[PDB]
Amino acid sequence: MKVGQDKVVTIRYTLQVEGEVLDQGELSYLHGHRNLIPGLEEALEGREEGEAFQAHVPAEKAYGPHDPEGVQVVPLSAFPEDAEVVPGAQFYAQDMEGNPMPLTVVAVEGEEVTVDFNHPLAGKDLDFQVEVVKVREATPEELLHGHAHP
Ligand SMILES: C=CC[C@@H]1/C=C(\C)C[C@H](C)C[C@H](OC)[C@H]2O[C@@](O)(C(=O)C(=O)N3CCCC[C@H]3C(=O)O[C@H](/C(C)=C/[C@@H]3CC[C@@H](O)[C@H](OC)C3)[C@H](C)[C@@H](O)CC1=O)[C@H](C)C[C@@H]2OC
Ligand SMILES: [Cl-]
Ligand SMILES: [Mg+2]
Ligand SMILES: [Mg+2]
Ligand SMILES: [Mg+2]
Numbered sequence: 556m557k558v559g560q561d562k563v564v565t566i567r568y569t570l571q572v573e574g575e576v577l578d579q580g581e582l583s584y585l586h587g588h589r590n591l592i593p594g595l596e597e598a599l600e601g602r603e604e605g606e607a608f609q610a611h612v613p614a615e616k617a618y619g620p621h622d623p624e625g626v627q628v629v630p631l632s633a634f635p636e637d638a639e640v641v642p643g644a645q646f647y648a649q650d651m652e653g654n655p656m657p658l659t660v661v662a663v664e665g666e667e668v669t670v671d672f673n674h675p676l677a678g679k680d681l682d683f684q685v686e687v688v689k690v691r692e693a694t695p696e697e698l699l700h701g702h703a704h705p
Pocket of ligand 3: 561
Protein backbone atom coordinates (compact mmCIF):
# COMPACT_ATOMS: atom_id res chain seq x y z
CA MET A 556 0.00 0.00 0.00
CA LYS A 557 1.30 3.47 -0.94
CA VAL A 558 1.41 6.60 1.21
CA GLY A 559 -1.44 8.92 0.33
CA GLN A 560 -4.45 10.88 1.55
CA ASP A 561 -6.21 9.35 4.58
CA LYS A 562 -3.62 6.63 5.08
CA VAL A 563 -2.10 6.10 8.52
CA VAL A 564 1.64 5.87 7.92
CA THR A 565 4.29 4.53 10.28
CA ILE A 566 7.79 5.91 9.74
CA ARG A 567 11.17 5.50 11.41
CA TYR A 568 13.19 8.69 11.19
CA THR A 569 16.36 10.46 12.18
CA LEU A 570 16.51 14.25 12.18
CA GLN A 571 19.80 16.03 11.55
CA VAL A 572 20.36 19.75 11.44
CA GLU A 573 23.71 21.08 10.21
CA GLY A 574 25.42 17.75 10.84
CA GLU A 575 24.02 17.22 14.33
CA VAL A 576 21.48 14.51 15.16
CA LEU A 577 18.59 16.18 17.00
CA ASP A 578 16.02 13.40 17.20
CA GLN A 579 15.26 9.85 16.22
CA GLY A 580 12.20 7.69 16.58
CA GLU A 581 9.14 6.04 15.16
CA LEU A 582 5.85 7.81 14.42
CA SER A 583 2.44 6.89 13.08
CA TYR A 584 0.57 9.83 11.55
CA LEU A 585 -2.55 10.50 9.52
CA HIS A 586 -1.42 11.64 6.06
CA GLY A 587 -2.92 14.65 4.29
CA HIS A 588 -4.29 16.48 7.35
CA ARG A 589 -1.44 18.92 8.08
CA ASN A 590 -0.12 16.64 10.84
CA LEU A 591 3.46 16.70 9.53
CA ILE A 592 5.72 19.46 8.25
CA PRO A 593 4.67 20.10 4.62
CA GLY A 594 8.01 19.26 3.02
CA LEU A 595 8.30 15.81 4.56
CA GLU A 596 4.71 14.97 3.75
CA GLU A 597 5.41 15.89 0.13
CA ALA A 598 8.47 13.62 0.22
CA LEU A 599 6.42 10.73 1.61
CA GLU A 600 3.54 10.98 -0.88
CA GLY A 601 3.40 7.89 -3.11
CA ARG A 602 6.10 5.96 -1.22
CA GLU A 603 5.65 2.20 -0.86
CA GLU A 604 5.72 0.34 2.44
CA GLY A 605 9.33 -0.69 3.09
CA GLU A 606 10.95 2.19 1.20
CA ALA A 607 13.86 4.05 2.78
CA PHE A 608 15.10 7.44 1.62
CA GLN A 609 16.69 10.76 2.50
CA ALA A 610 14.81 14.06 2.50
CA HIS A 611 16.33 17.52 2.71
CA VAL A 612 13.55 19.91 3.75
CA PRO A 613 14.19 23.66 3.33
CA ALA A 614 13.13 25.94 6.20
CA GLU A 615 10.22 27.25 4.11
CA LYS A 616 8.71 23.75 3.89
CA ALA A 617 9.61 22.95 7.50
CA TYR A 618 9.19 25.29 10.49
CA GLY A 619 9.39 28.46 8.40
CA PRO A 620 11.77 31.43 8.31
CA HIS A 621 13.13 33.18 11.40
CA ASP A 622 10.85 36.15 12.13
CA PRO A 623 12.84 39.16 13.42
CA GLU A 624 9.69 40.32 15.26
CA GLY A 625 10.11 37.23 17.42
CA VAL A 626 13.18 38.65 19.17
CA GLN A 627 12.11 40.80 22.09
CA VAL A 628 13.39 42.34 25.31
CA VAL A 629 11.55 41.48 28.52
CA PRO A 630 12.09 42.34 32.20
CA LEU A 631 14.06 39.82 34.26
CA SER A 632 11.23 40.00 36.82
CA ALA A 633 8.96 38.18 34.33
CA PHE A 634 10.92 34.96 34.84
CA PRO A 635 10.31 32.22 37.46
CA GLU A 636 11.54 33.31 40.90
CA ASP A 637 14.60 31.06 41.18
CA ALA A 638 15.10 29.99 37.57
CA GLU A 639 18.43 30.09 35.76
CA VAL A 640 18.13 32.82 33.13
CA VAL A 641 21.04 32.22 30.76
CA PRO A 642 21.49 31.90 26.98
CA GLY A 643 19.71 28.80 25.69
CA ALA A 644 17.35 28.49 28.66
CA GLN A 645 13.76 27.78 27.66
CA PHE A 646 10.51 28.89 29.25
CA TYR A 647 6.89 28.42 28.39
CA ALA A 648 4.83 31.56 27.91
CA GLN A 649 1.58 32.79 26.32
CA ASP A 650 0.55 35.87 24.33
CA MET A 651 -2.06 38.52 25.17
CA GLU A 652 -4.81 36.20 23.94
CA GLY A 653 -3.58 32.99 25.55
CA ASN A 654 -1.99 31.08 22.68
CA PRO A 655 1.20 29.11 23.43
CA MET A 656 4.30 31.28 23.07
CA PRO A 657 7.34 29.39 24.43
CA LEU A 658 10.66 31.23 24.36
CA THR A 659 14.42 30.79 24.41
CA VAL A 660 16.78 33.20 26.19
CA VAL A 661 19.28 34.86 23.83
CA ALA A 662 21.17 37.16 26.21
CA VAL A 663 20.94 38.97 29.55
CA GLU A 664 22.01 42.49 30.48
CA GLY A 665 21.10 43.61 33.98
CA GLU A 666 17.33 43.49 34.39
CA GLU A 667 16.71 43.06 30.64
CA VAL A 668 16.47 39.66 28.98
CA THR A 669 16.59 39.29 25.22
CA VAL A 670 14.41 36.34 24.20
CA ASP A 671 13.38 34.62 20.98
CA PHE A 672 9.77 33.49 20.46
CA ASN A 673 10.58 31.77 17.16
CA HIS A 674 10.44 28.03 16.81
CA PRO A 675 13.95 26.75 17.70
CA LEU A 676 14.18 25.31 14.18
CA ALA A 677 12.91 28.42 12.38
CA GLY A 678 15.27 29.28 9.51
CA LYS A 679 16.87 25.83 9.54
CA ASP A 680 16.95 23.22 6.77
CA LEU A 681 16.11 19.76 8.08
CA ASP A 682 17.73 16.52 6.98
CA PHE A 683 15.70 13.33 7.45
CA GLN A 684 16.62 9.70 7.02
CA VAL A 685 13.25 7.97 6.68
CA GLU A 686 11.91 4.42 6.44
CA VAL A 687 8.25 3.73 5.64
CA VAL A 688 7.41 0.88 8.01
CA LYS A 689 3.67 0.46 7.53
CA VAL A 690 0.82 1.95 5.53
CA ARG A 691 -2.83 1.25 6.31
CA GLU A 692 -6.20 2.90 5.81
CA ALA A 693 -7.32 5.34 8.49
CA THR A 694 -10.33 4.24 10.54
CA PRO A 695 -13.50 6.34 10.57
CA GLU A 696 -12.64 7.29 14.15
CA GLU A 697 -9.23 8.56 13.02
CA LEU A 698 -10.75 10.62 10.20
CA LEU A 699 -13.32 12.16 12.53
CA HIS A 700 -10.69 12.97 15.18
CA GLY A 701 -8.19 14.19 12.60
CA HIS A 702 -5.22 12.14 13.79
CA ALA A 703 -3.82 8.63 14.09
CA HIS A 704 -4.68 6.32 17.00
CA PRO A 705 -2.43 3.54 18.48
C1 LIG B 1 0.16 16.05 21.53
C2 LIG B 1 0.11 16.07 20.22
C3 LIG B 1 1.17 16.78 19.43
C4 LIG B 1 2.23 15.76 18.99
C5 LIG B 1 3.31 15.69 20.01
C6 LIG B 1 4.21 14.73 20.00
C7 LIG B 1 3.97 13.41 19.34
C8 LIG B 1 5.33 14.82 20.98
C9 LIG B 1 6.71 14.81 20.30
C10 LIG B 1 7.68 15.29 21.35
C11 LIG B 1 6.67 15.64 19.00
C12 LIG B 1 7.70 15.24 17.93
O1 LIG B 1 8.10 13.91 18.16
C13 LIG B 1 7.55 13.08 17.17
C14 LIG B 1 8.98 16.13 17.91
O2 LIG B 1 9.62 15.82 16.68
C15 LIG B 1 10.67 16.66 16.24
O3 LIG B 1 11.75 16.42 17.09
C16 LIG B 1 11.02 16.14 14.83
O4 LIG B 1 11.90 15.35 14.64
C17 LIG B 1 10.19 16.66 13.67
O5 LIG B 1 10.39 17.77 13.17
N1 LIG B 1 9.22 15.86 13.17
C18 LIG B 1 8.95 14.51 13.70
C19 LIG B 1 9.13 13.47 12.62
C20 LIG B 1 8.25 13.83 11.42
C21 LIG B 1 8.58 15.23 10.90
C22 LIG B 1 8.43 16.28 12.02
C23 LIG B 1 6.94 16.52 12.25
O6 LIG B 1 6.21 16.89 11.32
O7 LIG B 1 6.44 16.37 13.48
C24 LIG B 1 5.04 16.66 13.68
C25 LIG B 1 4.82 18.13 13.87
C26 LIG B 1 5.65 18.80 14.91
C27 LIG B 1 4.02 18.78 13.04
C28 LIG B 1 3.70 20.24 13.13
C29 LIG B 1 2.22 20.40 13.44
C30 LIG B 1 1.84 21.87 13.44
C31 LIG B 1 2.13 22.43 12.06
O8 LIG B 1 1.79 23.78 11.97
C32 LIG B 1 3.65 22.38 11.87
O9 LIG B 1 3.90 22.92 10.59
C33 LIG B 1 5.20 23.48 10.57
C34 LIG B 1 4.08 20.91 11.81
C35 LIG B 1 4.59 15.86 14.91
C36 LIG B 1 4.73 14.37 14.63
C37 LIG B 1 3.11 16.12 15.29
O10 LIG B 1 2.25 15.72 14.24
C38 LIG B 1 2.70 15.34 16.54
C39 LIG B 1 2.84 16.27 17.71
O11 LIG B 1 3.39 17.31 17.63
C40 LIG B 1 10.28 18.14 16.26
C41 LIG B 1 11.48 19.00 15.94
C42 LIG B 1 9.88 18.44 17.68
C43 LIG B 1 8.64 17.64 18.00
O12 LIG B 1 8.34 17.96 19.36
C44 LIG B 1 7.50 19.08 19.39
CL1 LIG C 1 -1.61 12.13 13.25
MG1 LIG D 1 -8.60 7.03 0.25
MG1 LIG E 1 8.13 -4.45 5.79
MG1 LIG F 1 15.76 49.41 28.22
